[PDB]
Design a protein around this motif. Structure first.
Motif, PDB file in Angstrom:
ATOM      1  N   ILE A 118      -2.941   0.328  -4.555  1.00 47.68           N
ATOM      2  CA  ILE A 118      -2.271   1.461  -5.180  1.00 47.68           C
ATOM      3  C   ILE A 118      -1.798   2.413  -4.146  1.00 47.68           C
ATOM      4  N   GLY A 119      -2.620   2.784  -3.187  1.00 52.55           N
ATOM      5  CA  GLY A 119      -2.150   3.678  -2.115  1.00 52.55           C
ATOM      6  C   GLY A 119      -1.580   5.105  -2.269  1.00 52.55           C
ATOM      7  N   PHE A 120      -2.367   6.101  -2.653  1.00 53.77           N
ATOM      8  CA  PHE A 120      -1.771   7.397  -2.954  1.00 53.77           C
ATOM      9  C   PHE A 120      -1.026   8.129  -1.879  1.00 53.77           C
ATOM     10  N   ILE A 124       0.832  -1.194   0.000  1.00 56.25           N
ATOM     11  CA  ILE A 124       0.000   0.000   0.000  1.00 56.25           C
ATOM     12  C   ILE A 124       0.868   1.246   0.000  1.00 56.25           C
ATOM     13  N   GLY A 134       2.514   4.475  -7.046  1.00 59.13           N
ATOM     14  CA  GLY A 134       1.855   5.555  -6.343  1.00 59.13           C
ATOM     15  C   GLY A 134       2.765   6.371  -5.450  1.00 59.13           C
ATOM     16  N   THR A 170       1.209  -0.021  -9.821  1.00 55.65           N
ATOM     17  CA  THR A 170       0.942  -0.007  -8.390  1.00 55.65           C
ATOM     18  C   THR A 170       2.158   0.470  -7.597  1.00 55.65           C
ATOM     19  N   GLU A 181      -7.910   2.736  -3.144  1.00 56.88           N
ATOM     20  CA  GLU A 181      -6.567   2.376  -2.727  1.00 56.88           C
ATOM     21  C   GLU A 181      -6.476   1.091  -1.894  1.00 56.88           C
TER      22      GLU A 181
END
Ligand code: ATP
Ligand code: ATP
Ligand code: ATP
Ligand code: K
Lengths: 346, 48, 335, 335
Positions: free
Chosen positions: C112-114, A119, D113, D111, C107
């Protein structure tokens, strides 16, 4: 049948009607249960257990490496540097917080989640000071990818084995013996429920009995094959509708001796093993049934299960084991065979 | 229902009589009540 | 005028109908099995439907979740930053809308996690739903991946394409009758250990009362070692002679025009590259076999190399034949 | 010229022309099928090209999408301060080039980010592009992973190795004729449940006036129980004895030059390393049939351990023998 009531254990049942091999091995050289065995049990679990082991494994890995990160952010004199509230964070910049903004084990755990499942929330990054943290990060990612791959392999292999549901091959719970085409015949009924065909099918019928030999030896559980009586001598069979697989016996097969009274005390047991490969799956399957002496309702004959409907044949499956007791000669196995002067002992 | 081991034809009413009374009327009533609530909501939203 | 019911329709596909089968049931796991084998059209939609559902569901678990911990209000009442500093208790930083919540949802279950929406550690329920969303995302991702791989694994096998000629013949070879179809092949790879079996379906009474309704005898085919193997490159002609032992031995010139016969033929074998077993079935009812005309030659030696021609796959020519039965022709020499 | 066309060429292949058949139509599934079975000098190329094309295409879309909403203009004019880029009005934040938008596209696809390129919920169209590209990216990732795993699962399935001979020897053996040849094996594995088959191709015209252009007769292989299985560790010498009824019974023992004949050998098995079925085959024309020569003993004890040398694998020795076909051996006791 009080004698049989006390004889419930004494019983010649080599294979249970279910199909298993009721036996008992012992005195064997069990080398052990090497490690890889456990992994195989991982493959063959059921969905509830597989899901549980999956989730538990992910959570255990996350918590464990979070505890490690907590220790790491402790030893580097990081938690104290944050706890100094002279300012919002007065001297927290130069001290090279080993992992940026890691305050307590809860926060370290959030970081573990953020670094294992890719993440990466950015709010808490590894810094350029502590090599130990970099070592633990490398270890984290390597173990993460291996665990991810192994669990993915487990879930996939439980998906790719979705073709297999259950073997569904059906026998007449009882046998039947009768006279057909002029001579004694042994029968049995075989049917299928699955829509798919069974290619390259074959059947085998064997007699299991305790034997004696003129030389003196005795083979306790002796097996001998018997012909399957097809038109051109071949153990092939087409299975669209259920049928009657008749292994008629003349002389070579061990049915010459059969006397009607003897069936209760009869020691011979018939075993049927048939096999073939399923067309739409590619797996070789094999189904086995046992015909004990108590289930051989002699003298009967089988019923007919094919009817003309409007343009397409209809078939029943309820009437499988139902028989009409057509009259037949008695104990003619040797009398009719070893033809008397009449040569028509029936 | 595209692959299973059952009577292929579609013909059944297993416990329908005490459920037909239930759904067929209940949902319609319910759909009626949901329409009613939609009406009250729309007119109120125009008011507010 | 309906055809008497046929045991195997001319295009394979055995058309039987058995009922009163004890409904075994509808196993909870059955949907997954049905799910594995879908048209690619569906497995490119159920993918999208599953992902989009899970995303929306966790988003709703999420916009509301931002509201409860006081997040929506701080940003809205004053300025986000101009008037005041952060409340610092925001569950996920800068999570403004039930629109923003939906964006955040993307996310977590898509990896993906911005970064502009961090996860603070105050609200424990938030941590619970994060664990749950991540686990569900992994399980759904793995199941879908396994489905996509299964339907990319089975892109090699397509369909059985083994072509029998339309109808049979009956002629004489070496002063005796025969029976011929014309098997053949289409694609490059040969079949391995291909086997052929001929069964005749008939209603057989018995001299002891019993009348097997639809009974199937097996009959031998022709080969000089009496072995049912075969090896095909160009279409062959698999005869199966008729003799005193054979059951067709009582067929007749006139009776075949109105007769109860059913000669099914089955052919088994594997395909080399795919390495998968297979079989093919077809037939010959009484209407379909016309006596006395043998099939026509195919292989022609061109100038360069042999040529197999398909233009006349099922073409027929008449030839000399006697109209008697099998037992009639061998009844007497003078006969 | 005048080369009579061989049915199957000496170097392991089938060479009979496919003519005049109808066109089944190249169905779209064939494209994916041919993607699956590629050698590795193309798979990685198509892989990379697909990834790059998706990246570039979506980057162009984002650049346009930061065009119509006028983000790009805004970033350029306000160079000195930018006033927080008009409070981040732009649909995609901090994208202010194409190359920068390309970096954003790489970030979203694979992925990563990074975070400088945050996305706001300011405009819907941006969310739609994000969802679309995300789902397409997952599909491409899954497809390529499936390709690579299919290739991985076929590492063992490599090629075929079975060592036949260029020479059939008809020398006498145990008081009759024979037609031997040598069969070998290279890989350390042992073929499970092997079988051999021998077929003879020649033109024939049946007594009833029907001609058959080619015609596969079969010939039995000698085995003291008439079983076609075999156990091939060392080189073996298959021998198809010539009984009175065999097709080769009337060869022109020393006028065997202008003879219209061909012999085919087919060996079937399943390899105990993979489980895949496999089959090798070859053919002997008239000109490659030595007469009178018998094969040469190979197996030689060396130091108490059995030794097999292929140096002398397929070389023969001339040895005197009768020169008259078996029929010329069957008429009189001493012919
Ligand atoms: N229509 C059917 N559905 C399911 N199973 C069947 C059916 N017909 C026969 N069988 C199976 O065949 C076996 C023996 O059947 P049998 O010929 O004895 O009929 P039955 O007396 O009705 O059998 P049971 O006593 O087991 O109900 C049973 O184990 C049964 O499972
Ligand atoms: N070129 C071909 N390719 C594949 N199959 C063919 C071809 N020609 C004929 N057939 C087969 O012939 C069978 C019946 O053909 P169809 O009836 O369409 O043409 P026909 O000439 O009337 O019959 P037939 O071709 O058998 O003489 C079909 O099962 C088909 O598979
Ligand atoms: N050492 C070997 N190992 C495996 N196969 C061999 C070997 N020697 C010959 N063969 C096989 O024998 C076949 C024909 O052998 P032949 O008696 O014609 O010798 P050759 O073909 O002249 O030898 P080469 O193929 O080396 O020129 C060839 O197809 C070849 O594959
Ligand atoms: K598979």
């Amino acid at each position: 049948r009080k004698p049989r009531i006390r004889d419930r254990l004494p019983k010649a049942r080599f294979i249970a009607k279910s199909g298993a091999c009721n036996l008992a091995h012992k005195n064997i050289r069990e080398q052990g249960r090497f490690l890889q065995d456990i992994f195989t049990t991982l493959v063959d679990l059921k969905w509830r257990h597989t899901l549980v082991i999956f989730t538990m494994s992910f959570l255990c890995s996350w918590l464990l490496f979070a505890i490690m990160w907590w220790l790491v952010a402790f030893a580097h004199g990081d938690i104290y540097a944050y706890m100094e509230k002279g300012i919002t964070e007065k001297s927290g910049l130069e001290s090279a917080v080993c992992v940026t903004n890691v305050r307590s084990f809860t926060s370290a755990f959030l970081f573990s989640i953020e670094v294992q499942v890719t993440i990466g929330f950015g709010g808490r990054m590894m810094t350029e000071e502590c090599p130990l943290a970099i070592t633990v990060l490398i270890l984290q990612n390597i173990v993460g990818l291996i665990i991810n791959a192994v669990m993915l392999g487990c879930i996939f292999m439980k998906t790719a084995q979705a073709h297999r549901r259950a073997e569904t091959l059906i026998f007449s719970r009882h046998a039947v013996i009768a006279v057909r085409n002029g001579k004694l015949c042994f029968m049995f009924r075989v049917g299928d429920l699955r829509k798919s065909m069974i290619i390259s099918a074959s059947v085998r019928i064997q007699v299991v009995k305790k034997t004696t030999t003129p030389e003196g030896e005795v083979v306790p559980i002796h097996q001998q094959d018997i012909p399957v009586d097809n038109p051109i001598e071949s153990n092939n069979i087409f299975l669209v509708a259920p049928l009657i697989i008749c292994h008629v016996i003349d002389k070579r097969s061990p049915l010459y001796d059969i006397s009607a009274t003897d069936l209760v005390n009869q020691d011979l047991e018939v075993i049927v093993i048939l096999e073939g490969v399923v067309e739409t799956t590619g797996i070789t399957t094999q189904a086995r049934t046992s015909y004990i002496a108590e289930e051989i309702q002699w003298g009967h004959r089988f019923v007919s299960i094919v009817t003309e409907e409007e343009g397409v044949y209809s078939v029943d499956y309820s009437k499988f084991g139902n028989t009409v007791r057509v009259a037949a000669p008695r104990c003619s196995a040797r009398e009719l065979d070893e033809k008397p002067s009449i040569l028509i002992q029936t | 229902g595209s692959q299973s081991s059952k009577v292929q034809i579609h013909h059944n009413t297993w416990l329908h009589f005490p459920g037909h009374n239930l759904r067929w009327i209940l949902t319609f009533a319910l759909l009626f009540v949901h329409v009613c609530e939609i009406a009250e909501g729309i007119v109120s939203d125009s008011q507010r």
